[PDB]
Amino acid sequence: AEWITGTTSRNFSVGREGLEYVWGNHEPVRVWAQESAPGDPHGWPHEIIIHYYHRHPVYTVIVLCGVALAILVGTASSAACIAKARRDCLTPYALAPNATVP
Amino acid sequence: FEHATTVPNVPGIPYKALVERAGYAPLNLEITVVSSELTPSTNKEYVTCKFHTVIPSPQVKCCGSLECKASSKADYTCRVFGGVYPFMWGGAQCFCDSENTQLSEAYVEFAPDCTIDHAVALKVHTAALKVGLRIVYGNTTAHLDTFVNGVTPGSSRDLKVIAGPISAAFSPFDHKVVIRKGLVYNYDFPEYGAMKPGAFGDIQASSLDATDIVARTDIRLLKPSVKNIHVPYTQAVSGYEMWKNNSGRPLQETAPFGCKIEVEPLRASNCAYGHIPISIDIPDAAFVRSSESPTILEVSCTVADCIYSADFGGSLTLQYKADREGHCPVHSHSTTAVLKEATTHVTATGSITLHFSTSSPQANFIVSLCGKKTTCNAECKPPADHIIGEPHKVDQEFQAAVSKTSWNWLLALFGGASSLIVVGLIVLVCSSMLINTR
Amino acid sequence: FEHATTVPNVPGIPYKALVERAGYAPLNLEITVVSSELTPSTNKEYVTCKFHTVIPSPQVKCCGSLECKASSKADYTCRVFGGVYPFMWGGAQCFCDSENTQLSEAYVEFAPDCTIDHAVALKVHTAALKVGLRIVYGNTTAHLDTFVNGVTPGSSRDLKVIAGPISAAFSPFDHKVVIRKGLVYNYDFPEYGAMKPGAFGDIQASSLDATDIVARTDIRLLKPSVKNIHVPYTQAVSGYEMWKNNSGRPLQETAPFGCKIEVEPLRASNCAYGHIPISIDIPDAAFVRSSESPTILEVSCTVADCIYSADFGGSLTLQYKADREGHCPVHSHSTTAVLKEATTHVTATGSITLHFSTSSPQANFIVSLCGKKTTCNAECKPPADHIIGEPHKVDQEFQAAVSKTSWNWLLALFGGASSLIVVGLIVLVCSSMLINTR
Numbered sequence: 001a002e003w004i005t006g007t008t009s010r011n012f013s014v015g016r017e018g019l020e021y022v023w024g025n026h027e028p029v030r031v032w033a034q035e036s037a038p039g040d041p042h043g044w045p046h047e048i049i050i051h052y053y054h055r056h057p058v059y060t061v062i063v064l065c066g067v068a069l070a071i072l073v074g075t076a077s078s079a080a081c082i083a084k085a086r087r088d089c090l091t092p093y094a095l096a097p098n099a100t101v102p
Numbered sequence: 103f104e105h106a107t108t109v110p111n112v113p114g115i116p117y118k119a120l121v122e123r124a125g126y127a128p129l130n131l132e133i134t135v136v137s138s139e140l141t142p143s144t145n146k147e148y149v150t151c152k153f154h155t156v157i158p159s160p161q162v163k164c165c166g167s168l169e170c171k172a173s174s175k176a177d178y179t180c181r182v183f184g185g186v187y188p189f190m191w192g193g194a195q196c197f198c199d200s201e202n203t204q205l206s207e208a209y210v211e212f213a214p215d216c217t218i219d220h221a222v223a224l225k226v227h228t229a230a231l232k233v234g235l236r237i238v239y240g241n242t243t244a245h246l247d248t249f250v251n252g253v254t255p256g257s258s259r260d261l262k263v264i265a266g267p268i269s270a271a272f273s274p275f276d277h278k279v280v281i282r283k284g285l286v287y288n289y290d291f292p293e294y295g296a297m298k299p300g301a302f303g304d305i306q307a308s309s310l311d312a313t314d315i316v317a318r319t320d321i322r323l324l325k326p327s328v329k330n331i332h333v334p335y336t337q338a339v340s341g342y343e344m345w346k347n348n349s350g351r352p353l354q355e356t357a358p359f360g361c362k363i364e365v366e367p368l369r370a371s372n373c374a375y376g377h378i379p380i381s382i383d384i385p386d387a388a389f390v391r392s393s394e395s396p397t398i399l400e401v402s403c404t405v406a407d408c409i410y411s412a413d414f415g416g417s418l419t420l421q422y423k424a425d426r427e428g429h430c431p432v433h434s435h436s437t438t439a440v441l442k443e444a445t446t447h448v449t450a451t452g453s454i455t456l457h458f459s460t461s462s463p464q465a466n467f468i469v470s471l472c473g474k475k476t477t478c479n480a481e482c483k484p485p486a487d488h489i490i491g492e493p494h495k496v497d498q499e500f501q502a503a504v505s506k507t508s509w510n511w512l513l514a515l516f517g518g519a520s521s522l523i524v525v526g527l528i529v530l531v532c533s534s535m536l537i538n539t540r
Numbered sequence: 541f542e543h544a545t546t547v548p549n550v551p552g553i554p555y556k557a558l559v560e561r562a563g564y565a566p567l568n569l570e571i572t573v574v575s576s577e578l579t580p581s582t583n584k585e586y587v588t589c590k591f592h593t594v595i596p597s598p599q600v601k602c603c604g605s606l607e608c609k610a611s612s613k614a615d616y617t618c619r620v621f622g623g624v625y626p627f628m629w630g631g632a633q634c635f636c637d638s639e640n641t642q643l644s645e646a647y648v649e650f651a652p653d654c655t656i657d658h659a660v661a662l663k664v665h666t667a668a669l670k671v672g673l674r675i676v677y678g679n680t681t682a683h684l685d686t687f688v689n690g691v692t693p694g695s696s697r698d699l700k701v702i703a704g705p706i707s708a709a710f711s712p713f714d715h716k717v718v719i720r721k722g723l724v725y726n727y728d729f730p731e732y733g734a735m736k737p738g739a740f741g742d743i744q745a746s747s748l749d750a751t752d753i754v755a756r757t758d759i760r761l762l763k764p765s766v767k768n769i770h771v772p773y774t775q776a777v778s779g780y781e782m783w784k785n786n787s788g789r790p791l792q793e794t795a796p797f798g799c800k801i802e803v804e805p806l807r808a809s810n811c812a813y814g815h816i817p818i819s820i821d822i823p824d825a826a827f828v829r830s831s832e833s834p835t836i837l838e839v840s841c842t843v844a845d846c847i848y849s850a851d852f853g854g855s856l857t858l859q860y861k862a863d864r865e866g867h868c869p870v871h872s873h874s875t876t877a878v879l880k881e882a883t884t885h886v887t888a889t890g891s892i893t894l895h896f897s898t899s900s901p902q903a904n905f906i907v908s909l910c911g912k913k914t915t916c917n918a919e920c921k922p923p924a925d926h927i928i929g930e931p932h933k934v935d936q937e938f939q940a941a942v943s944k945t946s947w948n949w950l951l952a953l954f955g956g957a958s959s960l961i962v963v964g965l966i967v968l969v970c971s972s973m974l975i976n977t978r
């Protein structure tokens with residue numbers, strides 16, 4: 001609630017639930033914010049990133065964090081498995097130096 | 103036919119559904135909450151206002167003494183002074199030099215203007231939601247005033263509606279409320295007979311005309327040190343006025359869920375907070391058999407210019423061929439997209455346009471026309487208008503708010519990670535069989 | 541002086557205690573619950589009784605038609621019959637051979653004698669217990685009528701009492717009750733508007749004089765096939781009479797905890813279920829200092845012919861050698877023994893006699909006179925009378941109801957078992973010593 005004199009602008013945050021403002025003796029005015037974020041959900045991936053960042057910031061941060069963690073763990077574990085199998089194929093041939101590898 | 107579903111508590115926003123009895127044609131059914139009524143049970147404690155602090159004429163007895171008995175007047179205060187010498191217009195008032203007793207007298211009462219400017223203290227309890235329901239089924243309408251308690255039917259006889267218990271209890275009023283001139287405040291007032299001077303509720307009575315008025319305003323009768331007849335008094339400021347200083351703002355401008363407070367039964371009107379389970383016993387006269395309903399030989403939906411917003415943004419046209427001309431229920435079988443129209447008119451062949459509101463970037467949903475199932479697929483653009491003056495008809499869902507392109511990207515990355523897992527374990531198994539050979 | 545204790549809810553049965561200030565003489569104090577009133581908050585749903593099922597005069601129209609509109613009368617049923625030819629005393633009643641019509645009309649109203657024989661359906665909530673108390677302290681008496689919620693105070697002259705919340709909430713009334721002619725029944729009646737024919741609640745109204753009456757009796761109008769002018773109707777029987785068949789027994793003769801159900805505010809009187817914590821603001825004028833309190837050099841009790849019955853069975857004599865003659869409180873500090881007299885007259889040296897009631901087979905308890913403590917022990921025989929017309933003044937305790945010789949036997953066997961266990965551990969220690977020695 002604010003008592004206002006003069007010509008000054010006020011910023012109010014509107015969500016999906018809504019916002020009702022009464023100005024003077026006028027009837028209450030109800031507004032609802034639509035999900036009109038900049039970007040494009042159907043396009044290149046970056047536009048999707050800006051769109052869902054402006055809509056739900058923490059949600060898209062944790063989703064991309066999960067994606068980055070998943071790809072990092074997947075590549076690291078696959079590389080570890082390939083390295084272990086490559087060692088398991090090599091060291092039978094490494095203990096015998098004069099042996100001819102196929 | 104007993105049909106059970108769940109409607110939102112939002113005023114307006116028609117909730118549409120089909121009742122599909124097996125042997126009969128699908129029947130449209132939409133329920134609209136026209137109004138809501140949180141009416142708590144209120145117990146009246148007292149009425150307060152500005153006191154009058156009326157002081158009667160000073161009673162003097164000279165060459166004598168006085169004492170007063172207890173009185174039922176509000177905030178009784180006697181005091182005896184034994185050295186006065188009153189001087190009205192025309193010299194001294196009686197005939198003794200020094201020993202002169204004056205009874206200073208003070209008590210409070212309601213002001214003459216408390217019939218309007220008064221505050222009523224109320225204690226509330228759990229509130230019962232009463233909702234007005236506009237239910238249309240087939241071509242018939244019904245207006246009901248149901249209770250949300252979960253057992254009481256609606257006041258319409260023929261259509262039996264049980265509005266189940268609402269998911270969350272809201273109760274915008276705290277346990278103690280104060281009503282002044284149509285404005286409602288959540289104030290923790292003092293209890294009856296538990297007054298405090300200078301705060302709200304200095305003076306208390308069960309009614310304006312009641313004679314059982316109680317008060318403990320801190321009044322102190324000072325000693326008259328002037329020639330002229332006087333009752334000097336020091337009193338606390340009116341706590342009703344002090345509350346009018348710091349009343350804050352009423353619940354008409356503070357209450358959650360955007361609902362307005364009225365004072366004649368003290369009800370909260372149009373609170374959009376929870377979900378109401380509802381069960382309707384539709385009479386069998388509304389249902390018609392599948393023979394009399396037209397059947398759709400072929401249906402296909404093509405949707406153009408869809409946009410996910412509160413308004414019905416998006417036009418899907420059904421191209422259809424049907425044998426018999428008639429009327430047909432039309433429905434959207436997704437909780438994300440809702441159609442504007444419930445019934446259409448079907449000819450032998452043609453196309454009907456329909457408007458829907460969705461909350462998903464993709465318009466992949468099932469639309470039904472005289473039963474039937476057609477699937478609609480499109481990419482829906484984000485809205486250009488930032489803010490709209492009408493609420494959203496549908497609620498967001500996690501599986502729908504994520505677009506199909508984004509779903510393909512995340513599933514491609516996750517499937518790539520999983521494929522690296524699978525090839526790692528496969529080559530590990532190959533190493534295992536090689537070390538079994540060794 | 542804020543003294544807090546706990547009283548049983550049994551009507552009668554005085555509970556005695558000592559308030560023992562450090563610098564003052566011991567003060568006796570007993571509470572008696574004279575009456576209790578457990579009043580729930582009742583919400584009235586509807587009233588019901590028999591129905592009159594009045595039928596208006598048939599309306600005929602010959603060479604015409606009669607369609608009938610809806611009516612606000614309870615359970616309105618209208619039928620149109622288009623092949624009638626009615627007869628009265630005088631012959632044919634109209635001028636068309638076959639093109640006639642009759643409007644059979646039937647609705648439901650209250651019977652004339654429903655001002656007495658009617659049932660009120662009530663929905664009750666949690667019940668607030670209000671207790672009347674006879675308190676005595678020192679040598680003065682006082683009466684109280686206070687609530688049990690633990691917030692509001694009971695005031696009597698210079699006594700402020702807070703009766704704390706009771707240990708268990710009983711509420712003998714179910715959520716739905718029915719009152720008929722002063723008899724209360726725990727019946728799950730149908731809700732307002734949920735009329736079922738042939739059941740309690742065929743007819744419903746807000747009051748007996750209300751014009752907004754609702755009814756769903758299974759009334760059907762048949763086609764007249766007789767010469768006489770006649771409305772053939774067939775109706776389900778009154779569910780009020782059916783409930784009078786199967787009313788069972790009322791709550792006056794079924795409610796637990798032995799307390800009486802009354803109907804004018806719908807309260808439950810003299811319910812003895814749970815212990816009440818109580819806090820008492822004792823005025824300082826009741827106490828006396830220890831200088832005026834006659835102490836005793838040596839107290840010595842002895843019990844003779846003790847018996848543990850509900851009556852005050854068993855007498856004990858204090859022999860005392862006090863220093864002054866006066867009045868003095870006496871007390872039994874155990875919760876098993878309770879004394880009849882809370883006061884006695886003390887002399888220089890003598891012997892007073894007192895009566896006590898116990899629940900334990902042993903007379904082991906501590907008795908106090910002007911302060912002081914003494915414990916005297918003898919044997920209490922079981923009573924010979926099987927029942928008695930008065931409730932027990934105390935409650936059994938497991939530590940007390942087991943007799944002293946039975947504690948001796950049980951502890952003898954348990955100590956024998958423990959002694960053999962101790963012997964086993966001793967010889968195990970000796971074996972450990974030997975295996976350390978080797």
Ligand SMILES: *[C@@H]1O[C@H](CO)[C@@H](O)[C@H](O)[C@H]1NC(C)=O
Pocket residue numbers: 011
């Ligand atoms: C209000 O919002 C506008 C939107 O662009 C912004 O530019 C402006 O700085 C804001 N004003 C204040 C006072 O925060």
Ligand SMILES: *[C@@H]1O[C@H](CO)[C@@H](O)[C@H](O)[C@H]1NC(C)=O
Pocket residue numbers: 240241390429
């Ligand atoms: C409902 O009534 C309208 C009136 O025009 C009619 O067209 C329609 O067919 C009716 N509905 C059904 C299911 O018969």
Ligand SMILES: *[C@@H]1O[C@H](CO)[C@@H](O)[C@H](O)[C@H]1NC(C)=O
Pocket residue numbers: 346347348
């Ligand atoms: C009354 O209330 C107002 C509102 O806060 C406060 O600022 C003011 O000091 C108070 N007193 C007077 C005399 O206006």
Ligand SMILES: *[C@@H]1O[C@H](CO)[C@@H](O)[C@H](O)[C@H]1NC(C)=O
Pocket residue numbers: 679680867
């Ligand atoms: C209390 O008052 C009664 C009433 O006569 C009297 O008999 C008794 O002696 C009084 N008690 C004391 C301790 O004075």
Ligand SMILES: *[C@@H]1O[C@H](CO)[C@@H](O)[C@H](O)[C@H]1NC(C)=O
Pocket residue numbers: 784785786
């Ligand atoms: C009425 O109630 C009684 C009590 O159970 C029942 O036995 C009887 O059959 C009923 N009917 C009549 C006509 O008495």
